[PDB]
Amino acid sequence: SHMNTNMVASELGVSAKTVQRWVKQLNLPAERNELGHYSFTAEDVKVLKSVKKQISEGTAIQDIHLP
């Protein structure tokens, strides 16, 4: 009912491994879909877009602010 890692990566314009790096580094919650794969919601996409935006602006991973 939601979006897997490939879908998220597609909407962000990054690779799937990049999404996985951020999710784990930033201790972000991730569910599992009907196949047991990682799954994300629209909220997650927005949060990960904020991560990408902040890194792009020069913010270090540890200085990132998340809701």
Swiss-Prot record:
Required for the formation of axial filaments and for anchoring the origin regions at the cell poles in sporulating cells, thus ensuring proper chromosome segregation in the prespore. Binds in a dispersed manner throughout the chromosome but preferentially to sites clustered in the origin portion of the chromosome, causing condensation of the chromosome and its remodeling into an elongated, anchored structure. Residues 5-25 bind DNA. The chain holds residues 1 to 65 of 184 of the full protein. It is found in: Cytoplasm. Belongs to the RacA family. This is Chromosome-anchoring protein RacA. It comes from the Bacteria.
